[PDB]
Design a protein around this ligand. Structure first.
Ligand code: AFH
Length: 322
């Protein structure tokens, strides 16, 4: 059986879809998935055993120079690749009008998606052949598992979702796996960042433990902050710039992670690595992670400026308890 998945945007949303592929694979041996996803996250689906062909899209990038000669070419290659196969099922796990009109609508096969009252954008429900009712009051990971279960004729396992992508890294874990912690400081908005000052204090509190700390960074200004956070700390290392897969191998070898509400935090949860995510303006109840050893840390008065290094270290300790 060959199924096509439409789940493009948000590294987090993409990662949350994995447990659903694990359920399907266990229930239906031989099942394989093709997956339409934003190029920036195209490596993620490849890490899962049930994933066959990845079909990248780069909306935002394209969208800005949409009629260009080179772009016109990419969009053409995309449509053709998208329509290449006749799927036994097309599952729109995105629930957006834009993705249903730009992707789902064009694929061959019975199209499944959420119904009018459960879809991210009600109107997208009109684009499906099969509309399923997926209760909103539950984690995104479970909602997608329910969607896959109902779309593919099998009952969702009572067990916790298994992202099943850690094994992709187990074979080539860093030599110093378990010897360090990874602090994910970079994110999309200022108010979501934990003040540099607190980061350095946390780091300082760990000085005599003998642990080492690695700092990822995806953009120049993020590298500069990482340099600032590392200064004077011989046991802290600013990572070189790497791919999603590369930073994913580093996370896999991390003993634990402290992070702000960002995609790499979601990657961490998918890799089953103990993780303490610190939230401020964003609510962990609505967008929290999912998985083993994930611990929520809400900043006082939803202001990260109020969260102390001491408080975060305490969570690390009690996250170790479990
Ligand atoms: N290979 C790589 N190595 C090191 N860093 C990498 C990287 N790739 C990306 N980043 C960095 O990761 C961050 C991505 O930004 P983000 O805003 O935190 O992205 P994301 O969409 O993943 O964050 C999500 O943002 C949502 C909203 O706040 C608005 O998008 C939250 O609800 C959700 O929980 C949270 F995960 C950026 O700083 C980016 O440079």
């Amino acid at each position: 059986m060959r199924v096509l998945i439409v789940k493009t945007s948000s590294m987090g949303d993409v990662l949350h879809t994995l447990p659903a592929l694990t359920d399907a694979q266990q229930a239906i041996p031989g099942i394989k998935f093709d997956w339409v996803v934003e190029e920036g996250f195209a490596q993620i689906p490849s890490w899962h055993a049930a994933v066959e062909r990845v079909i990248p899209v780069a909306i935002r990038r394209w969208r800005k120079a949409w009629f260009s000669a080179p772009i016109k070419a990419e969009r053409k290659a995309f449509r053709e690749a998208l329509q290449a196969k006749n799927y036994d099922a097309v599952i729109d796990a995105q629930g957006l009008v834009k993705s249903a009109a730009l992707v789902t609508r064009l694929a061959h096969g019975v199209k499944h998606g959420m119904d009018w009252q459960t879809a991210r954008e009600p109107l997208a429900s009109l684009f499906y052949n099969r509309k399923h009712h997926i209760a909103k009051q539950q984690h995104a990971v479970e909602r997608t598992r329910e969607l896959f279960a109902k779309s593919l004729g099998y009952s969702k396992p009572q067990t916790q979702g298994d992202y099943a992508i850690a094994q992709h890294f187990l074979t080539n874990l860093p030599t110093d796996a378990g010897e360090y912690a990874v602090f994910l400081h970079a994110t999309t908005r200022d108010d979501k960042h934990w003040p540099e000052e607190h980061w350095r204090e946390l780091i300082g509190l760990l000085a005599d433990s003998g642990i080492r700390i690695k700092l990822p960074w995806g953009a120049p200004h993020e590298e500069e902050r990482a340099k600032r956070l590392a200064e004077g700390f011989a046991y802290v290392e600013v990572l070189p710039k790497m791919s999603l897969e590369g930073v994913a191998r580093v996370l896999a070898g991390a003993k634990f992670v402290v992070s702000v509400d960002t995609g790499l935090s979601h990657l961490t949860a998918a890799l089953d690595r103990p993780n303490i995510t610190v939230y401020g303006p964003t609510d962990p109840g609505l967008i929290g992670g999912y998985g083993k050893n994930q611990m929520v840390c809400r900043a006082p008065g939803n202001e990260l400026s109020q969260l102390t290094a001491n408080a975060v270290k305490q969570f690390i300790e009690e996250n170790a308890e479990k």
